[PDB]
Structures are given as C-alpha cells and as structure tokens.
C-alpha cells in the first residue's frame, strides 16, 4: 500500500535516499510515518517515528522527511551493517497500519566476483532407481545474483530444471544450486550436458558426458 | 528488559488451523496493545492487526478478516494468534511486535502512531500438501566430492562429514524446493569421506561413504 523502490545502493561514506510514497489518507494528511531496518534472519527495527524522530540508540545518519504523500529516509556516512531491508510505515486514517513493499539497500565494500562452478553427473545409485539428477554448484560470487541455462549438447533445456536463490555465504559472497532432472534414457542418448552460470555478463561454464 | 517470546516453528497441511503463541516480559502487560505482522519468504510486512489487552477488543487487517483471531491472557501475559483456513500463500514468519510509547505516560499504547520498538524473534510457518518423507543419499563425483541428499520433507537438514571431523573445505548448499512438495541440497567438500545426514522430522540418519 506504500510503495519503496526495490533496492537501492551506496558506497561507504557516501549517501543513500529512499523513498516512500503513499497517499493523503496516510502520508499525507499524518505525521505518523515509521521507518524500519531489517537484517536478513532478525526481527525489524524501528530507525523513525513521526517522521523524523530517532529512537533511543540510532545515530543521527539516519535522516528522516516527508514531501506531501512522499515520506522518505535517507541514511550518511554509509558503513557495510547499513546494508539490510529497510521498510516504511504509515498511520492509515480509518484505525489501520500500512507498510511498504521494503527496500533492499546494499553497501558498496566487496568486490565483484565470478562464481565458481561445480556440475555432477548423476549416480550409477540414482540410475539404478530409474531417475538422473544433474547438480550444478554455484560459489563464491558477487553481486548475488545469477541466471542458469542448461544444454542438451548444444540444445538447451529447460524441461527439468530447478534452481534455488542466492543465498549469503559466511565469506559475504554468494552461493546457489540449479538441478536438472533427465530420464536415464536422455542422460545416455546425448553426448554431453553443460551447466551455464551468467554472471554480471560473463558466463562460467562446466559440461559432464555418459 | 522486554522480551517478545514466539512459539516454535510449525508445519501445516492446507486447510489446518495454527495458533501461535507470543510471551511477554519486561513491561507492565495491559498498558501495550500487541501487534501481528506478517512476513512471506522474501517478500515485505504485512499488517494482521492488533489486539489491546486491556478490554481484549482487537482489530483486524481487511486482508485477514475473517480467518484471524487475536485473543490475550493477562495471568500467563501471552498473546495468541490463530489462523484458519490455512494455504501455502501463508507459508510465512510471524511476529509479534510491542508498540512504542513515545508519551510521557505509557497507558493504552495502540501502536496507531509511533511505530513498534520491540518485536519477537518470528515463528516460521510452512504449509504445504506434502508429508514427512526421508532422504535419499547419493554420492557426487566427477567425470570436488560430496552427497545429494534427494527428496527429503520437511526442513531441516543436518549434514556432517566424518562424524564433526571433517570441517575444512565443507560446503553445504541451502535445499532447493521441487514442484513435488519435496527439498534437495548437496554437501561437498573441496582419506575416507563419509556423510552424516540427519533429518529429524522423519527420524532418519543416514551415513554415506563417497570415493
């Protein structure tokens, strides 16, 4: 009912302002506008409320404002634990409490990183029940976001193919897992599969044959 | 000094009822409304609405309206939410949250206004039409070594390599979540290497040497 943008971003030291539109009956006409942060696996904590004020123990980067039905936050002298979900709040005239769809800030410190790729071929086990599962292990990368494409030789493949989301490693990087179920009848009948990994442009690249 | 205590986690088939629990501490019970808020896997808050000790009167989001109920115990000082109807879409955590007084007398808090300060660690919900079911162990090798630890309900999964010995070079990868209702992970490590899954809920171990 309030709306963020989905993901902002900055670099250590520098700023970050993020938005939070929604409409007379609730940011507009009240000054009732609440901020959260949220790290992955926690509860959310208040950083705002009415507007601008700052519970006890929130430094003053946390800066909060409103322009008619646009309340907004903005966050200085950026440091890495800035990086979580930041959500909005507002009074909703009527007794209700409206949320926005949140905000993923990220901070700048990591550098970029190319996954690395593990592909298994399915188990002789596996085949013997009459099933072929093909397992490709994605590492150790930065940003945390890939697309995974699968090929039939040189034919792709998408019939079969789940994939998990990133998720945040303990070294900060990112991991994922893509999984190709094939009948054992197709794993033998091609020459090869290849496990396709794209990263920020660049592929990375890994093939397993009968 | 207040401390927001939810129940556990839960599991659920479709069309089941949940009621959760949310202990409380540290403030004076009645003088705070309780709030319930709602969050799906990487998605945002939701509100559910409130509920106020006090007189007991609750009020319920529109989006809950009719499948929620909010009721409060002052002897045991627990809140309590119930959901019914139950479908996966409610596969979500939980939480309770405490509103924040910003008054100089903290009396009737509704947490209309001044935003929640403190909230409990979440409980985490899962419905699915899926039923406990254990794993199936398969080694990974080439032509890197590890096991695929196939088609396994519900989370969670331990994964070990020769009994806590092995913890050098381990990766265990998050489960992936088939269309069948079923999960799948993979341990890898980069003389002998052998698994230790263990999956409780189905009350299976199992140990798997992988050349």
């Known amino acids: 009912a309030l709306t963020q943008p989905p993901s902002a971003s900055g670099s250590p030291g520098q700023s970050v302002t993020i938005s939070c539109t929604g409409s007379?009956?609730?940011?507009?006409?009240?000054?009732?506008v609440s901020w959260y942060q949220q790290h992955p696996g926690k509860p959310p904590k208040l950083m705002i409320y009415?507007?601008?004020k700052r519970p006890s123990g929130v430094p003053d980067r946390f800066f909060g404002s409103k322009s008619g039905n646009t309340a907004s936050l903005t966050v200085s002298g950026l440091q890495a634990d800035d990086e979580a979900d930041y959500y909005c709040?507002?009074?909703?005239?009527?007794?209700?409490?409206?949320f926005g769809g949140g905000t993923k800030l990220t901070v700048l410190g990591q550098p970029k990183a190319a996954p690395s790729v593990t592909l298994f071929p399915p188990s002789s086990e596996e085949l013997q029940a009459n099933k072929a599962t093909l397992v490709c292990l994605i590492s150790d990368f930065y940003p945390g976001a890939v697309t995974v494409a699968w090929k039939a030789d040189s034919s792709p493949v998408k019939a079969g193919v789940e994939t998990t989301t990133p998720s945040k490693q303990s070294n900060n990087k990112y991991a994922a897992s893509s999984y190709l179920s094939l009948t054992p009848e197709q794993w033998k009948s091609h020459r090869s599969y290849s496990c396709q990994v794209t990263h920020e442009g660049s592929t990375v690249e890994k093939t397993v044959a009968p | 000094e207040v401390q927001l205590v939810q129940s556990g986690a839960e599991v659920k088939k479709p069309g089941a009822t949940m009621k959760i629990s949310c202990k409380v501490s540290?403030?004076?019970?009645?003088?705070?409304?309780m709030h319930w808020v709602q969050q799906a896997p990487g998605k945002g808050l939701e509100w559910m609405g409130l509920?106020?000790?006090?007189?007991?009167?609750?009020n319920y989001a529109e989006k809950f309206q009719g499948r929620v109920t909010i009721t409060a115990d002052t002897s045991t000082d627990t809140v309590y939410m119930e959901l019914s109807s139950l479908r996966s879409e409610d596969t979500a955590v939980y939480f309770c949250?405490?509103?924040?007084?910003?008054?100089?007398?903290?009396?009737?808090?509704?947490?209309?206004?001044?935003?929640?300060?403190?909230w409990g660690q979440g409980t985490l919900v899962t419905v699915s039409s899926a039923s406990t079911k254990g794993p199936s162990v398969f080694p990974l090798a080439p032509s890197a070594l590890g096991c695929l630890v196939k088609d396994y309900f519900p989370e969670p999964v331990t994964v070990s390599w020769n009994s806590g010995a092995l913890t050098s070079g381990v990766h265990t990868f998050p489960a992936v979540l088939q269309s069948s209702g079923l999960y799948s992970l993979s341990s890898v490590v980069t003389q002998t290497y052998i698994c230790n899954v263990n999956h409780k809920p189905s009350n299976t171990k199992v140990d798997k040497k992988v050349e």
């Open positions: 949250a405490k509103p924040h007084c910003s008054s100089r007398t903290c009396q009737r808090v509704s947490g209309y206004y001044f935003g929640m300060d403190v």
């Open positions: 540290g403030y004076p019970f009645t003088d705070y409304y």
């Open positions: 509920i106020d000790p006090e007189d007991g009167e609750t």
């Open positions: 007379s009956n609730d940011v507009g006409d009240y000054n009732f």
């Open positions: 009415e507007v601008t």
């Open positions: 709040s507002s009074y909703a005239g009527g007794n209700s409490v409206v």
